[PDB]
Amino acid sequence: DTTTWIWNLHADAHDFDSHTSDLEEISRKVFSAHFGQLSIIFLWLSGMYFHGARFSNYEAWLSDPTHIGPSAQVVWPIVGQEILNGDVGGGFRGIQITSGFFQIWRASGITSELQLYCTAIGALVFAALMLFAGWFHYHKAAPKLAWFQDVESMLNHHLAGLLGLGSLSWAGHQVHVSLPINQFLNAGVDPKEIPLPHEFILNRDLLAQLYPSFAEGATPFFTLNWSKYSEFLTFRGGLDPVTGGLWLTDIAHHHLAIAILFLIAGHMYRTNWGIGHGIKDILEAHKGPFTGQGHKGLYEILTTSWHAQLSLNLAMLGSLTIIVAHHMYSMPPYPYLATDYATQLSLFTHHMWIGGFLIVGAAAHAAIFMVRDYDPTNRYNDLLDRVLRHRDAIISHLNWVCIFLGFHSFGLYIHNDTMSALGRPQDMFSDTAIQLQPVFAQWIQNTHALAPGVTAPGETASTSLTWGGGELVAVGGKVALLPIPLGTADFLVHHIHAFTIHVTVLILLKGVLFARSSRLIPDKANLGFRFPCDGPGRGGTCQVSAWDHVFLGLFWMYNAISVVIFHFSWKMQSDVWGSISDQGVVTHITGGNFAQSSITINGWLRDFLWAQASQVIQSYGSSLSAYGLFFLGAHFVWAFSLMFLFSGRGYWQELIESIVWAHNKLKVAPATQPRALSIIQGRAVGVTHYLLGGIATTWAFFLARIIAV
Amino acid sequence: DFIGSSTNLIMVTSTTLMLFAGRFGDPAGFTLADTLACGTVGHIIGVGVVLGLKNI
Amino acid sequence: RPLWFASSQSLSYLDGSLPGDYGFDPLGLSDPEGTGGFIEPRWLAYGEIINGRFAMLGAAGAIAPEILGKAGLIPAETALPWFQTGVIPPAGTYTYWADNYTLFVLEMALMGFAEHRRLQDWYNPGSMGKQYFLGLEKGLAGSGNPAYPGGPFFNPLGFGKDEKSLKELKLKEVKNGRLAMLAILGYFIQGLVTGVGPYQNLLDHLADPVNNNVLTS
Amino acid sequence: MRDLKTYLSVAPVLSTLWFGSLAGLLIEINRLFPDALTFPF
Ligand code: CLA
Ligand code: CLA
Ligand code: CLA
Ligand SMILES: CC1=C(/C=C/C(C)=C/C=C\C(C)=C\C=C\C=C(C)\C=C\C=C(C)\C=C\C2=C(C)CCCC2(C)C)C(C)(C)CCC1
Ligand code: SF4
């Protein structure tokens, strides 16, 4: 009839709760969708593993990791695009990759291209298996609802079996394959002369030569004489001098300990045999001193709703991803990763964006649960009611903190800028005039530096080299890691981070709390989770729904994450990364200008944005010209997004009316009447293009800058 | 060789004492799962004691 | 009837119609609730019976060549342990009138005919005696029970004319099948651990019982 | 089946087939007559 049906078709494709009201069918559809996603992931992994076997310089890089740039993509010479095949070294031409796949393969003991082919074939087989399993479990043997609600058995298996046994199996693989092959590689042995991994298993004296403890067999494990296994199960700490990563023996010991702990932890919840706790009993019986009655009623809420569980899991996964991003740059786990700067910058930025998106999703699905599944009559919970009964106090206090933080974090920058402009450099907040030192962080750094030898007797070195007191590490003439100083410039940016995080939290929490009703629209629950407005009455009620709160919070998440990656990039380029001469003098890439230039807004515009963007804008005619082309294209998308965000719907409907008249004049009028986009759709289109343009611009800028220098 | 050392006696006593504490078809309804759990707990306790004592 | 680790839940549905039912089901796999896929009591009983029959064949077949080889009944060239008769090429091979892969194809074809006919009888009863099959369709009609087809082809000696004798023979068959499956598992584990033939393991244990045990290995 | 033909005639699949054939053709001329600015005929 009209064109809005086409748009509505793709908008509700995965909303199973709207299609049917039966929990069993929703659960079955969710199971099959998960199977399909797993199949797609396996296909992606198969492609990645295959491409590195046929179209890569993996072997040449393996013979010389420092001086050869990794590559796994090659372009066809059709329209003159073969200029993208740069000289990456090793007698190979192609596109340099920054996903850190070569380091993973080297740390796993892979030495030839025959093993990658087998891995690719196995992954393809697994993808086919997952697709068939999804089809079978939806159409032939679909489980019942009572199967999905056995959350005591799901936790036991997902802790003991999935996580407990995976770590143990990986520790076994490491001990049996990764340690000896990496020891041979680190000894200067040519890769084609290293014995195959199965020779270590079949021939035992070969393993005994490298580690004498393997001659004793498995008897010391059973006799509790565990000190004999200290040859390959160490507690050293620090980085490997040869490669620049963590010792593989430490990783093996860590995985063994983690596996044992998870296996122990997986025997907690009660099952058919009557030993262990029940989750409902733990929730009900818990009554501390201020809760009073307790958490009575959360079991039904969390077992009869999919949106609450999705929100909780999304929040936890986002926080975990951010932690993973932070913990990998400071303690590099793979060989030849710290001194390869292109990959280090790319791995930190990827997971930050992923974590931010997942957190915003958690907020959105909490709002959806509040709008749809909330039921005070049948599923009453006390704590949620008390939180809903004083929501005015929560929001008003969170509103104040944002203003205070914003003033006391941005007015300092503005004051510095004004004092610099007026020729009064002695009145700025800097290391020379007025110092705001982060004393607590420095105390933490000193404590962590001094912890080995006093509070950690078994440790031979500190966990990381960022805490001041350690020694510089150099691999192949480049700087891998060294202590990171903290000063007045690091005091302001941390409070910028805090301010942005608090504002995002304010927006999302306000949306979630006022999803059901507010003082303006008492019946907002009946209008739905996703509705544009409630008319121009009461002065105007534009964007009152929770969907619009998530739409507003996406912008602030993007604003917050962008400052983090800029801070990381400039601080690492100016204070850590660099090169070392033969006599031991470190020359950083930008020569330590972060301390003095990063205290005014002019310093970020001139010393960071203007100075570091000269690489991308001069990439025309070289193998990096694709980054120069993507730099300009992303600006177009970002500026194109503004048409949907700034304008309304009536103007475009009238324009389409005139266009339809001109079409009717020539008997080319379609039977499907054209319609302008809805109010909600126009908002969704704008933010998508906005985020795409911004992220693509930053991506091209970073990748073109860091590969060249 | 190993039989009769300190480790053997220590963990034998640990397991037996844990089983006796757990107990105090079968007259008392001691399910096989209970026996497995009590033996396991005795084993972790004994391993932790032996490893700690072996250091000093 | 005797009960072996029986439980209240398992005793609810294992009445005793199946042959050799002892009430043993700690995991409750055969519970009539939530039946689907291949987890169905009828299919589970059928699978147990078929696995038992194949195990009773294999347990004697694997150890037969080693028994006669020591007694001189067969040439030493054919007195190989069960894992050196070409089943595992790395462990050793023997040269027959044809290589292993054409033997594999011939086995697959013949047993595909047999097993597909059996499966078609399982799905719908009595339909294997209707279509003309070289005039052999008269005896392959079955008897309505998938695991006990009967008939002239499968019961030529006319055993179990009475129901009591049939039940006793079924019980004995299932007991022998369970024992044979345990024996085959022992075969696999001994072959993987010791590295010699099972009859060699028994001879070594008999020669010096105090030495050739699990403890020394 | 009839449903196979009906699903194949829907707008997205038909449009994707048409555009793929078009792109292949255009690449064919661009490969056969590369670096072309004027008609020499
Ligand atoms: C495990 C992750 C997960 C899962 C299972 C879901 C599941 C769901 N979400 Mg959801 N969400 C998530 C994460 C997740 N979300 C995150 C992280 C966010 C934060 C951004 C959101 C934000 C969100 C909102 C705001 C809404 C949902 C909604 C929904 C429901 C309907 C979704 C739908 O119809 O999509 C249909 C699928 C699409 C529309 C496809 C989107 C296409 C993207 C935007 C463009 C990508 C461009 C691409 C890069 C270029 C391709 C080019 C090519 C086309 C040529 C469904 C239950 C909706 C809901 O419940 O309403 C009642 C809803 O309004 N989600
Ligand atoms: C075959 C169908 C068809 C035809 C004959 C026309 C004809 C016309 N359009 Mg038009 N248009 C079409 C489809 C068509 N349109 C579609 C699908 C859109 C949406 C994208 C538009 C959007 C559009 C706008 C916004 C405007 C016109 C205008 C015009 C007039 C100016 C001449 C011109 O080429 O404008 C340029 C036309 C375009 C740039 C449209 C793009 C061409 C599309 C992609 C072709 C699609 C063909 C389609 C797949 C047919 C399939 C056939 C198959 C079943 C066999 C002219 C009468 C202008 C006018 O005078 O005011 C009304 C004007 O401002 N059109
Ligand atoms: C997340 C994954 C997942 C989950 C939760 C389930 C869950 C379930 N499946 Mg299932 N399945 C899966 C994946 C999964 N499946 C895949 C990938 C396949 C392959 C297509 C199947 C094929 C399958 C069949 C054919 C059947 C089920 C059935 C069932 C149900 C009964 C299972 C049971 O009682 O245990 C039974 C468990 C056993 C008998 C033990 C089997 C042990 C296996 C053989 C060992 C696996 C070895 C592994 C490959 C080793 C890896 C080594 C390494 C080199 C990779 C249960 C709801 C059954 C049902 O009735 O559905 C309702 C049924 O008949 N599933
Ligand atoms: C009087 C009487 C009697 C008695 C008996 C008994 C009392 C026995 C017992 C026994 C037992 C009851 C045992 C148990 C055990 C168990 C276990 C033992 C399990 C498990 C464990 C584990 C698995 C562990 C592991 C580990 C490792 C490996 C490493 C780390 C550490 C640990 C330790 C954790 C009889 C019957 C004769 C007769 C009648 C009368
Ligand atoms: S028509 Fe537009 S501006 Fe007016 S209330 Fe609705 S959404 Fe707001």
mmCIF file with all atom_site columns, C-alpha atoms in Angstrom, chain D residues 7-20:
data_model
loop_
_atom_site.group_PDB
_atom_site.id
_atom_site.type_symbol
_atom_site.label_atom_id
_atom_site.label_alt_id
_atom_site.label_comp_id
_atom_site.label_asym_id
_atom_site.label_entity_id
_atom_site.label_seq_id
_atom_site.pdbx_PDB_ins_code
_atom_site.Cartn_x
_atom_site.Cartn_y
_atom_site.Cartn_z
_atom_site.occupancy
_atom_site.B_iso_or_equiv
_atom_site.pdbx_formal_charge
_atom_site.auth_seq_id
_atom_site.auth_comp_id
_atom_site.auth_asym_id
_atom_site.auth_atom_id
_atom_site.pdbx_PDB_model_num
ATOM 1  C CA . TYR D 1 7  ? 11.374 -16.114 -3.544  1.00 0.00 ? 7  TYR D CA 1
ATOM 2  C CA . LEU D 1 8  ? 13.891 -15.659 -6.377  1.00 0.00 ? 8  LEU D CA 1
ATOM 3  C CA . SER D 1 9  ? 11.726 -12.983 -8.051  1.00 0.00 ? 9  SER D CA 1
ATOM 4  C CA . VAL D 1 10 ? 11.512 -10.763 -4.952  1.00 0.00 ? 10 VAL D CA 1
ATOM 5  C CA . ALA D 1 11 ? 13.025 -7.295  -5.322  1.00 0.00 ? 11 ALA D CA 1
ATOM 6  C CA . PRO D 1 12 ? 16.260 -7.667  -3.263  1.00 0.00 ? 12 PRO D CA 1
ATOM 7  C CA . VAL D 1 13 ? 17.482 -10.931 -4.816  1.00 0.00 ? 13 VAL D CA 1
ATOM 8  C CA . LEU D 1 14 ? 16.646 -9.860  -8.374  1.00 0.00 ? 14 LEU D CA 1
ATOM 9  C CA . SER D 1 15 ? 18.281 -6.463  -7.838  1.00 0.00 ? 15 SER D CA 1
ATOM 10 C CA . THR D 1 16 ? 21.423 -8.075  -6.412  1.00 0.00 ? 16 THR D CA 1
ATOM 11 C CA . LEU D 1 17 ? 21.674 -10.478 -9.357  1.00 0.00 ? 17 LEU D CA 1
ATOM 12 C CA . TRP D 1 18 ? 21.192 -7.632  -11.837 1.00 0.00 ? 18 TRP D CA 1
ATOM 13 C CA . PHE D 1 19 ? 23.774 -5.384  -10.173 1.00 0.00 ? 19 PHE D CA 1
ATOM 14 C CA . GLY D 1 20 ? 26.297 -8.219  -9.895  1.00 0.00 ? 20 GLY D CA 1
#
